[PDB]
Amino acid sequence: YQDICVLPTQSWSCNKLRCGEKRMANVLCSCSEDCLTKKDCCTDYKSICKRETSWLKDQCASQCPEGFDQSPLILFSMDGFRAEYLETWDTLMPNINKLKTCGTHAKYMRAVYPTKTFVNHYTIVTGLYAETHGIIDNNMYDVKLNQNFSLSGSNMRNAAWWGGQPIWHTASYQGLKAATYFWPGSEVKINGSYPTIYKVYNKSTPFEARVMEVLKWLDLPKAKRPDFSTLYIEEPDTTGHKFGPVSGQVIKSLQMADRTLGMLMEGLKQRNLHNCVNLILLADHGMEAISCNRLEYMTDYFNTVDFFMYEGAAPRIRSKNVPKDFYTFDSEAIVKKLTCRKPKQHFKAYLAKDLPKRLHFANNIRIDKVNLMVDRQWLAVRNKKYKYCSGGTHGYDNEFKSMEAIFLAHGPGFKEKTEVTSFENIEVYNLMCDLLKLKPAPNNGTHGSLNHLLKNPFYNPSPAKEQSPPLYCLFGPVPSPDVSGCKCSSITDLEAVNQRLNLIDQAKMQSEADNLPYGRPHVLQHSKYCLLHQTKYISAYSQDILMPLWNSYTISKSLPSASDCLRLDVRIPTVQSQTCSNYQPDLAITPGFLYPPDFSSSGPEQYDALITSNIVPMYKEFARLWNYFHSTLLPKYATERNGLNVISGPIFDYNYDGHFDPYDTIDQYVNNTKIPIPTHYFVVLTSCENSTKTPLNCPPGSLKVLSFILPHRPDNSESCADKSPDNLWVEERMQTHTARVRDVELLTGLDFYSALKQPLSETLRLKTFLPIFINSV
Numbered sequence: 001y002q003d004i005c006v007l008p009t010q011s012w013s014c015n016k017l018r019c020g021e022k023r024m025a026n027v028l029c030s031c032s033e034d035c036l037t038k039k040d041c042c043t044d045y046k047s048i049c050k051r052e053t054s055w056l057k058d059q060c061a062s063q064c065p066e067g068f069d070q071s072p073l074i075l076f077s078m079d080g081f082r083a084e085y086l087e088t089w090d091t092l093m094p095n096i097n098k099l100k101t102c103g104t105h106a107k108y109m110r111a112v113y114p115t116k117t118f119v120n121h122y123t124i125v126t127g128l129y130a131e132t133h134g135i136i137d138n139n140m141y142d143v144k145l146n147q148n149f150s151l152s153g154s155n156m157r158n159a160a161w162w163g164g165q166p167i168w169h170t171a172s173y174q175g176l177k178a179a180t181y182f183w184p185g186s187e188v189k190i191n192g193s194y195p196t197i198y199k200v201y202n203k204s205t206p207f208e209a210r211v212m213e214v215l216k217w218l219d220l221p222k223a224k225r226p227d228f229s230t231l232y233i234e235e236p237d238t239t240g241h242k243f244g245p246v247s248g249q250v251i252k253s254l255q256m257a258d259r260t261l262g263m264l265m266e267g268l269k270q271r272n273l274h275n276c277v278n279l280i281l282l283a284d285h286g287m288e289a290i291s292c293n294r295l296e297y298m299t300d301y302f303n304t305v306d307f308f309m310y311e312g313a314a315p316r317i318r319s320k321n322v323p324k325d326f327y328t329f330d331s332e333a334i335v336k337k338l339t340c341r342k343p344k345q346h347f348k349a350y351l352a353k354d355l356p357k358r359l360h361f362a363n364n365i366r367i368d369k370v371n372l373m374v375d376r377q378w379l380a381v382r383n384k385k386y387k388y389c390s391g392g393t394h395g396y397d398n399e400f401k402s403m404e405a406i407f408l409a410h411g412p413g414f415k416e417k418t419e420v421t422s423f424e425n426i427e428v429y430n431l432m433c434d435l436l437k438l439k440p441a442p443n444n445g446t447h448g449s450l451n452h453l454l455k456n457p458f459y460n461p462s463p464a465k466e467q468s469p470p471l472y473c474l475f476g477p478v479p480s481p482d483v484s485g486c487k488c489s490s491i492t493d494l495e496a497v498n499q500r501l502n503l504i505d506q507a508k509m510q511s512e513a514d515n516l517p518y519g520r521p522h523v524l525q526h527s528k529y530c531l532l533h534q535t536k537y538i539s540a541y542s543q544d545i546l547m548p549l550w551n552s553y554t555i556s557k558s559l560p561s562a563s564d565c566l567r568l569d570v571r572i573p574t575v576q577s578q579t580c581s582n583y584q585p586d587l588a589i590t591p592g593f594l595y596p597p598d599f600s601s602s603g604p605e606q607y608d609a610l611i612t613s614n615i616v617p618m619y620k621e622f623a624r625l626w627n628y629f630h631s632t633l634l635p636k637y638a639t640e641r642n643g644l645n646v647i648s649g650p651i652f653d654y655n656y657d658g659h660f661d662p663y664d665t666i667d668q669y670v671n672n673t674k675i676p677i678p679t680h681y682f683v684v685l686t687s688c689e690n691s692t693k694t695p696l697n698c699p700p701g702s703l704k705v706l707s708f709i710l711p712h713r714p715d716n717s718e719s720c721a722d723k724s725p726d727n728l729w730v731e732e733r734m735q736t737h738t739a740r741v742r743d744v745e746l747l748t749g750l751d752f753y754s755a756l757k758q759p760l761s762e763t764l765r766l767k768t769f770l771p772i773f774i775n776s777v
């Protein structure tokens with residue numbers, strides 16, 4: 001029986017016959033004693049040679065052992081492990097399934113865009129969007145550096161590419177030690193230094209060898225023992241590329257991944273650490289099927305192709321002559337030439353600033369202006385010679401279900417037998433800091449939003465303090481003469497109609513209860529504004545922008561004068577007001593309403609909406625979207641959801657950094673005026689997850705939110721709808737522009753839901769939720 005003792009020279013498991021065997025040259029992994037004292041053991045050693053119960057055969061059932069002060073944290077990434085693999089194949093992966101059964105797992109973890117390996121691994125350890133950490137793709141150019149970055153080049157090890165602070169520096173700077181067994185960035189002298197221990201990347205290293213060395217670091221003297229370590233394997237990504245995500249080959253690769261994790265857990269058990277180590281097992285992105293039959297070619301759109309293209313699932317286009325022509329390159333002409341060309345194009349071109357704001361993909365010089373958003377399972381490539389089109393790939397929109405990643409966790413810091421809703425991989429950095437009792441460097445995670453995964457949360461979130469309390473808008477006389485140019489000939493007693501805008505204290509409180517049921521937004525921006533109380537809606541009107549910061553109203557389940565009737569608001573000083581004359585006839589902009597007059601009961605109520613403090617400058621083509629949304633879509637939503645609380649308002653993000661900006665920054669205004677033009681309009685729809693309740697009697701833990709950040713564009717070319725005779729394209733357009741409430745807050749400087757009677761950390765979950773339709777549609 002040589003074979004079962006020729007196995008050691010090629011196997012990592014403690015087979016039945018070799019329990020006690022004689023050490024020779026040379027076994028990769030060693031049974032049996034003296035394996036233990038020599039710390040040479042095959043991970044199964046005790047279950048297989050000592051007849052102990054293996055980790056796997058055990059039941060689910062905070063005891064770190066000798067010299068383990070604080071829980072070590074292990075971050076284990078399996079490249080390309082899509083959330084779907086776990087949902088359908090979990091019984092083919094016994095070790096991961098145990099972990100899933102006994103620990104804490106998410107329904108899925110959302111990656112960042114583009115859904116690429118270096119982008120997402122670096123986001124995981126920094127908590128940063130790619131536009132901030134700087135690794136915006138596996139391939140990129142930087143005109144300031146005038147340097148190219150690639151996965152097969154030594155420029156990638158240049159620290160100038162790598163921004164932010166990876167978790168291994170956060171630990172090291174605060175007195176801990178970090179060891180990485182492969183991780184993008186770990187071989188770079190980021191901020192001038194390396195992890196405490198790190199390995200030179202070698203894709204050929206047996207996964208088993210990677211686990212055994214991670215186990216040895218745990219075996220180190222306490223003085224040198226890492227407190228944080230990473231583990232990385234290339235499967236199921238490698239096989240997924242070659243054969244696609246639905247293939248026998250990928251299942252084989254997933255089982256090989258499953259055994260990798262099995263070896264790790266048995267090794268922890270052996271060392272009595274299984275209930276000591278906190279372990280996070282996750283992935284950088286998912287995997288999707290491609291075909292040489294599903295290719296879009298630039299040659300079909302350009303007679304002449306004088307440009308450089310990053311091809312595939314997340315394309316960009318830039319000048320071929322860089323850096324001379326990097327900026328003069330006409331990205332707008334490229335986008336226009338690619339727009340609405342064939343009835344069923346399988347991609348859509350964008351300037352980066354017009355990309356859905358939820359992608360946070362614009363504010364970096366390396367992010368070429370021309371971006372293509374590609375339909376799932378397709379690729380956009382230069383010409384018909386493109387060759388890398390069989391099997392699988394990734395890169396797409398992080399909303400696609402195939403791009404979702406796994407997230408499983410286990411250890412004393414984590415709840416047991418617990419399943420949490422999906423969350424974003426930007427949240428994981430704060431989580432790891434909490435598990436290592438580290439203070440996080442500034443990042444894009446929302447600290448505390450993942451506290452429901454943890455047994456005793458290390459971080460307790462603080463409410464944001466309002467920076468700008470309201471000012472007073474005083475009731476006053478109609479100016480005489482009235483030089484607004486506004487007209488509303490139907491009004492018979494103007495002083496009486498305007499007294500409806502001057503509510504008694506109990507009417508204010510009633511309006512507050514019905515239309516601001518979660519409290520008024522707090523203003524974190526430095527802004528001068530006042531609150532306008534009305535029966536059906538309340539707003540914060542700001543002289544800084546001559547319009548509301550926000551407008552809020554509640555519509556119940558079940559139930560259109562535009563500028564036939566409009567008048568100045570006597571509570572707003574004229575010099576701080578929009579006028580009807582400000583909207584001169586020769587214009588592409590027309591007044592839009594935040595609280596829609598088509599919702600108020602006919603009669604005196606409707607006059608409360610028809611005032612110059614309830615209007616926002618809208619492109620006519622955007623108004624078309626807006627009016628269809630509030631006249632047709634919104635009532636249908638409200639009937640389906642048993643009422644809706646609606647808060648809406650303008651966004652100005654002219655430096656496209658994803659945040660509100662000082663008012664000096666606005667670069668566009670209504671012609672001949674100083675009425676600023678918003679880049680986006682936000683809408684936040686709140687109802688009850690239990691549709692037997694209304695937005696007003698919902699338990700706070702059961703609120704349902706749907707937010708939109710709608711680009712304020714002068715045409716509807718994004719929807720290919722300017723020649724469209726209907727509005728059935730509006731819903732689809734809005735669906736790709738949903739957003740987290742947290743995105744709205746960042747862009748507006750507003751803070752919502754301050755009055756909810758639940759823990760702040762629960763409200764943070766609500767605010768980080770991303771509404772997604774695309775996998776339902």
Ligand SMILES: *[C@@H]1O[C@H](CO)[C@@H](O[C@@H]2O[C@H](CO)[C@@H](O[C@@H]3O[C@H](CO)[C@@H](O)[C@H](O[C@H]4O[C@H](CO)[C@@H](O)[C@H](O)[C@@H]4O)[C@@H]3O)[C@H](O)[C@H]2NC(C)=O)[C@H](O)[C@H]1NC(C)=O
Nearest residue numbers: 127128129132163164360441442443444445657658659746
């Ligand atoms: C995601 O999270 C990251 C991390 O917090 C965050 O990146 C940060 O962005 C802010 C603002 O956009 C940056 O603020 C800068 O701070 C630096 C520090 O070096 C200063 O150099 C800058 O000062 C300028 O702005 C002043 C405005 O008052 C000007 O007066 C002055 O003239 C300067 O031009 C600037 O304030 C911050 O540096 C980064 N941090 C990192 C590490 O990158 C990002 O904004 C978050 N993204 C989203 C969408 O929320």
Ligand SMILES: *[C@@H]1O[C@H](CO[C@@H]2O[C@@H](C)[C@@H](O)[C@@H](O)[C@@H]2O)[C@@H](O[C@@H]2O[C@H](CO)[C@@H](O)[C@H](O)[C@H]2NC(C)=O)[C@H](O)[C@H]1NC(C)=O
Nearest residue numbers: 585586587588589590617618619668669670671672677714
């Ligand atoms: C703001 O006005 C510009 C310019 O308006 C044109 O020039 C002005 C001096 C005045 O004479 C107007 O009557 C002219 O139309 C607008 O830019 C125009 O855009 C339209 C497309 O919508 C186009 O047909 C014209 O060529 C453009 N004019 C020029 C000279 O560029 C701009 O659209 C206006 N924006 C707003 C807020 O409506």
Ligand SMILES: *[C@@H]1O[C@H](CO[C@@H]2O[C@@H](C)[C@@H](O)[C@@H](O)[C@@H]2O)[C@@H](O)[C@H](O)[C@H]1NC(C)=O
Nearest residue numbers: 688689690691692693694697698699700702
């Ligand atoms: C929806 O709610 C119904 C009413 O239950 C009562 O109100 C809800 C909001 C909860 O607070 C519950 O504690 C109350 O008893 C339920 O009967 C019904 O089951 C709920 N629907 C679902 C799917 O749970």
Ligand SMILES: Nc1ncnc2c1ncn2[C@@H]1O[C@H](COP(=O)(O)O)[C@@H](O)[C@H]1O
Nearest residue numbers: 116117138182183184185201203234237
């Ligand atoms: N730490 C690393 N250093 C260098 N290259 C890496 C590292 N980790 C992964 N890779 C490579 O990146 C590939 C994944 O890229 P992709 O399939 O394009 O997402 C892997 O198959 C490896 O070839």
Ligand SMILES: *[C@@H]1O[C@H](CO)[C@@H](O)[C@H](O)[C@H]1NC(C)=O
Nearest residue numbers: 141146147148308320321322
């Ligand atoms: C970067 O690569 C491009 C090709 O995409 C090349 O034209 C350019 O000269 C390169 N620049 C440097 C500094 O290597």
Ligand SMILES: *[C@@H]1O[C@H](CO)[C@@H](O)[C@H](O)[C@H]1NC(C)=O
Nearest residue numbers: 163164165166169173191441
């Ligand atoms: C770089 O390292 C220095 C020295 O520890 C530290 O003060 C600084 O915060 C680090 N910067 C970043 C971006 O991590």
Ligand SMILES: *[C@@H]1O[C@H](CO)[C@@H](O)[C@H](O)[C@H]1NC(C)=O
Nearest residue numbers: 200201202203204205206209
């Ligand atoms: C990479 O690892 C393989 C497999 O262990 C080994 O054969 C090879 O020597 C390593 N390559 C380098 C360049 O170190």
Ligand SMILES: [Ca+2]
Nearest residue numbers: 653657659661
């Ligand atoms: Ca901004």
Ligand SMILES: [Zn+2]
Nearest residue numbers: 079080117284
């Ligand atoms: Zn990857």
Ligand SMILES: [Zn+2]
Nearest residue numbers: 080117237241
């Ligand atoms: Zn890949």
